[PDB]
C-alpha cells in the first residue's frame, strides 16, 4: 500500500546477492515503512563499467522500484590527490568519466529518482584533525585483515600508510550519505563493513551491507 509489505521487499531484495549483514536489521530499515538511503560507491578511473555490474546496477533497480533512494556515488576524492612534488586523476577526468557511467546507469536506473553525488562534496572541507578523529576510531591490526592487505604484508611489500585511510573515507561516505544499504562486490565486503561500523562509532543507526557476485 505504497509501499509493499517488508517481508516482500526482502525476498526480492535478496535474490541474487551472496551476503547481507544483518537481514535482522535490513528487516527492521524496512518495517519503519519509509524510503531508505541506498549508496553504491564507484571508483572514477576506469574508462567505463564492464558488463559484470549487472546484477549490482539491476539490484539497485529493484531498490529503486520499491520506492527508496539510491545515490550513485563517484569516490573522486581519494583519485584526484596526488604525490608531493605517477599523476592522480584530473577533475576534468573524473567529470569525463563520471558522465559515461551515467550514460550507462540511465539505461536502467530512473535519473529523475537517482542522486549522482562525489564524495569530495564533503571531503574537500574535512581537515586534517577530523581525518585524525576517523582514524582514531580502527585498528593498525584490523586493517591488516584486508585480504589483499594480508598478502602484501606477508610477502614484504611495502604498504603506504594513506592506502589505511582509503576504507576510512568511504566508511565517513556512509555517515555523510545516512546510508541505510551500502552495496557492492563480494570482493568490497571489508570496506562495505567499515561504513556500518563508523556509524556507530559516530552515533548513527548502522547502514545494512549487501554483497552481489560482481561478473
Ligand atoms: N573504494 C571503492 C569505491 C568507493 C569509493 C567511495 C565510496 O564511498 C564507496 C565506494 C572501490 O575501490 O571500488
Ligand atoms: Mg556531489
Given amino acids: 500500500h505504497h509501499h509493499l509489505p517488508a517481508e516482500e521487499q526482502l525476498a526480492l531484495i535478496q535474490r541474487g546477492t551472496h551476503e547481507i549483514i544483518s537481514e535482522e536489521d535490513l528487516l527492521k530499515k524496512l518495517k519503519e515503512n519509509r524510503p531508505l538511503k541506498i549508496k553504491a560507491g564507484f571508483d572514477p578511473t576506469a574508462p567505463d563499467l564492464h558488463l559484470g555490474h549487472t546484477v549490482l546496477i539491476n539490484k539497485l533497480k529493484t531498490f529503486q522500484d520499491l520506492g527508496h533512494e539510491v545515490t550513485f556515488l563517484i569516490g573522486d576524492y581519494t583519485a584526484m590527490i596526488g604525490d608531493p612534488t605517477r599523476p592522480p586523476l584530473s577533475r576534468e577526468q573524473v567529470e569525463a568519466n563520471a558522465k559515461t557511467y551515467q550514460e550507462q546507469v540511465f539505461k536502467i536506473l530512473d535519473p529523475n529518482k537517482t542522486k549522482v553525488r562525489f564524495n569530495s562534496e564533503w571531503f574537500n572541507q574535512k581537515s586534517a584533525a577530523d581525518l585524525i578523529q576517523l582514524a582514531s576510531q580502527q585498528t593498525v591490526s584490523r586493517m591488516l585483515e584486508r585480504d589483499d592487505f594480508t598478502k602484501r604484508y606477508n610477502n614484504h611489500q611495502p604498504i ?21 544499504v551500502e552495496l557492492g562486490g563480494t570482493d568490497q565486503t571489508f570496506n562495505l563493513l567499515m561504513g556500518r561500523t563508523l556509524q556507530s562509532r559516530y552515533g548513527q543507526e548502522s547502514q545494512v551491507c549487501i554483497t552481489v557476485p560482481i561478473l
Fill in 160 to 180: 603506504a600508510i594513506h592506502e589505511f585511510l582509503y576504507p576510512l573515507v568511504q566508511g565517513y561516505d556512509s555517515i555523510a550519505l545516512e546510508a541505510d
